[PDB]
């Protein structure tokens, strides 16, 4: 009674193959990104490595979700889906731009992911619901290191954060538009995803030190 398309339908499994691949790839990239962040911030290596390892654990849970639905994920699709943000992350990393890397991974992707997971939970099959609930719980019981680091260093980071937001937030809108059709087959509405993302991202920007007016301008950039 949860979805208009049956979990066993080829329509559902086909859409799932791409959305599942996106979540798996996102988690794979989070693992690698956090390990690379530890190069830039060696003083916080233990915490960043712990986060990396947690995201690798999450990746394996989402792989189990695809297996349970008898779906082979389309990993090349997912790799293309993330190419823009992934490329921007790697370029910033190569220039030692920790602030930009953190905005992309710890703020933008983290908010996008939690949005996706929370909208998926109510429409997920019983097995995948439990896995996703566990992932969401983990994100809630662990400190968002990147957010806290940016908050501690806000005054010096502010200018770059504004610049990184302008360059990267429009890629989120692009991603959401790309994903909309498949997400709808899974019972996940674009409006709900956008809402969840803007609340999460906006709250993070507020915690870090941006004003209500600044967040308005920022969280709606390129939309």
Numbering used by the authors: 6 to 228
Reproduce the article's own wording on this structure.
In 2010, Schirmer et al. identified two genes involved in fatty alk(a/e)ne biosynthesis in cyanobacteria: acyl-ACP reductase and aldehyde decarbonylase (renamed as aldehyde-deformylating oxygenase, ADO). The crystal structures of cADO revealed that cADO belongs to the non-heme dinuclear iron oxygenase family of enzymes exemplified by methane monoxygenase, type I ribonucleotide reductase, and ferritin. The di-iron center is contained within an antiparallel four-α-helix bundle, where two histidines and four carboxylates (aspartate or glutamate) supply the protein ligands to the metal ions. The C1-derived co-product of the cADO-catalyzed reaction is formate.
The variants of cADO-1593 from Synechococcus elongatus PCC7942 and cADO-sll0208 from Synechocystis sp. PCC6803 were constructed, overexpressed, purified and kinetically characterized. However, there is only one hydrogen bond between Asn123 and Tyr145 in 1593, and the corresponding residues forming the other hydrogen bond in sll0208 and PMT1231 are Gln49 and Phe150 in 1593. Thr159 of PMT1231 and the equivalent one (Thr146) of sll0208 are also involved in the hydrogen-bonding network close to the di-iron center. We have observed that 1593 is more active than sll0208 against n-hexadecanal, so Thr146, Leu148 and Tyr150 of sll0208 were respectively mutated into the counterparts of 1593 - Leu, Arg and Phe. Since PMT1231 is more active than sll0208 towards n-hexadecanal under our assay conditions (unpublished results), Asp49 and Asn123 of sll0208 were mutated into the corresponding residues of PMT1231 - His and His respectively. cat values of sll0208L148R and sll0208D49H/N123H were increased by 70.5 ± 5.3% and 65.9 ± 4.4% respectively, whereas those of sll0208D49H, sll0208N123H and sll0208T146L were significantly reduced. Firstly, the results of 1593L146T, 1593F150Y, sll0208T146L and sll0208L148R have clearly demonstrated that the side chains of the residues consisting of the oligopeptide (residues 144 to 150 for 1593) whose conformation changed in the absence of the di-iron center had important effects on cADO activity. Unexpectedly, the Y150F substitution of sll0208, in which the hydrogen bond between Tyr150 and Asp49 is removed, had negligible effect on the catalytic activity. The triple mutant 1593Q49H/F150Y/N123H showed higher activity than WT 1593, 1593Q49H/F150Y and 1593F150Y, and the double mutant sll0208D49H/N123H exhibited improved activity than WT sll0208, sll0208D49H and sll0208N123H. Thus, some synergistic effects were observed for 1593Q49H/F150Y/N123H and sll0208D49H/N123H, implying that these two hydrogen bonds are beneficial for cADO activity and the co-existence of two His in both hydrogen bonds is more important than the presence of only one His.
